[PDB]
Amino acid sequence: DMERRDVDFELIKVEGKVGGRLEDTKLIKGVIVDKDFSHPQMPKKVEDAKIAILTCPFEPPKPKTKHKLDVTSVEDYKALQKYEKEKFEEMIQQIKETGANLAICQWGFDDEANHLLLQNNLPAVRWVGGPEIELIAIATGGRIVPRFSELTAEKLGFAGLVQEISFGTTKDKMLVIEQCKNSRAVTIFIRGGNKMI
């Protein structure tokens, strides 16, 4: 940032993990996270995908006010049961119609939504409510939408290589994104054999 003669330490993510060697420290021009995929059968590595940053969860809409739904007949219950799956299919098609290949939410998912995402071939990352969303939006350059109806083709981030990495015999998996454009945030991966190192 030469036009203002200042930097920002919040953009540089400094993360470390035990195991490995000290000479394995390298620079990554992307955003790394400590989460995995929502489904184990989802494809791990991808070559051409688009980032779809989302904030609303994969649940039906619910207002924060005090609302009461009254069902006094079988017709109302049947209409509600039909509208549930109707809205589910509508939002699933809206996620696919935007052209993106990898959506990013914030909160948890469900069962039917995860099954539909696996059937439609679209990986996703869960639990990223921290600065990871901001880092991805800054690096990839994609915009953030609050709902699903505003997910357009212009508000998508370009991804180069999104593939998780495996360590030793532990059950810890970390997803790292690389091959991005002119990003303004990099990550520093520190590896060692001791905790104080």
Partner 1 sequence: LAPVNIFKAGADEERAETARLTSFIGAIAIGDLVKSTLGPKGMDKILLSSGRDASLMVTNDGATILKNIGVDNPAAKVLVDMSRVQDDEVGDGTTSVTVLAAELLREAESLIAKKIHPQTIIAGWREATKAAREALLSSAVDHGSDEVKFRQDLMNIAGTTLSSKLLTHHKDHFTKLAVEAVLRLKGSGNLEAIHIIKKLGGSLADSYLDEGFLLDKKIGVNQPKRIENAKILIANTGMDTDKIKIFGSRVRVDSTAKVAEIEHAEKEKMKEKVERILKHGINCFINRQLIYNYPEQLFGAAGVMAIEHADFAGVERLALVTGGEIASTFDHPELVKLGSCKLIEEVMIGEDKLIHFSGVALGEACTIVLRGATQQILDEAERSLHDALCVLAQTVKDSRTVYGGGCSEMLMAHAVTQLANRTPGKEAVAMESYAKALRMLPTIIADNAGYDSADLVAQLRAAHSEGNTTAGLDMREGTIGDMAILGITESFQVKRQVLLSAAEAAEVILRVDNIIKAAPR
Partner 2 sequence: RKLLEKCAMTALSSKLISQQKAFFAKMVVDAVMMLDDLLQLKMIGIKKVQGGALEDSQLVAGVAFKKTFSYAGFEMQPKKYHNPKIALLNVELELKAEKDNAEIRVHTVEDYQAIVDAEWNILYDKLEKIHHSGAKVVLSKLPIGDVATQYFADRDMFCAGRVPEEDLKRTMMACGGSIQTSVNALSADVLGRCQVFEETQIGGERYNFFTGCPKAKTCTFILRGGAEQFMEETERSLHDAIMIVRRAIKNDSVVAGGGAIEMELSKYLRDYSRTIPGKQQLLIGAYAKALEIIPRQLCDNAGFDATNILNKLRARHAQGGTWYGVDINNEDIADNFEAFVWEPAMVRINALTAASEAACLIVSVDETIKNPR
- Shorter beta-carbon distance to partner 2: residue 29 or 173: 29
Element (H, E) at 83: helix 74-97
Taking CB under 8 A as the criterion, the residue among 112, 134, 164, 178 binding partner 1 is 112
- Shorter beta-carbon distance to partner 2: residue 94 or 114: 94
6-15 long-range CB contacts below 8 Å, 24 or more apart? 10/131, 11/135, 11/138, 11/184, 11/185, 11/186, 12/185, 12/186, 12/187, 12/188, 13/131, 13/135, 13/185, 13/186, 13/187, 13/188, 14/187, 14/188, 14/190, 15/187, 15/188, 15/189, 15/190
Start-to-end CA distance of the chain, whole Å, equals 31
Taking CB under 8 A as the criterion, the residue among 15, 84, 90, 97 binding partner 1 is 84
Element (H, E) at 96: helix 74-97
- Shorter beta-carbon distance to partner 2: residue 122 or 145: 145
In the bound complex, what is the minimum distance in angstroms from residue 182's beta carbon to partner 1? 35
Q: Which does 168 bind (CB under 5 to 8 A by kind): partner 1, partner 2, none?
A: partner 1
Q: Report yes or no: 67 and 12 within 8 Å, Cβ to Cβ.
A: no
Residue 6 CA neighbour count, 13 Å, CB half: 3
Taking CB under 8 A as the criterion, the residue among 4, 8, 67, 182 binding partner 1 is 67
65 binds partner 1 (CB under 8 A): no
In the bound complex, what is the minimum distance in angstroms from residue 57's beta carbon to partner 2? 13
Residue ranges in 42-81 that form contacts with partner 2 under rule CB under 8 A: 55, 61-70, 76, 79-80
Q: Which does 78 bind (CB under 5 to 8 A by kind): partner 2, partner 1, none?
A: partner 1
Cβ count within 10 A of residue 118: 17
Q: Which does 74 bind (CB under 5 to 8 A by kind): partner 1, partner 2, none?
A: partner 1
For partner 2, the binding residues (CB under 8 A) are 4, 6-8, 10-11, 55, 61-70, 76, 79-80, 83, 131, 133-134, 137-138, 143-144, 146-147
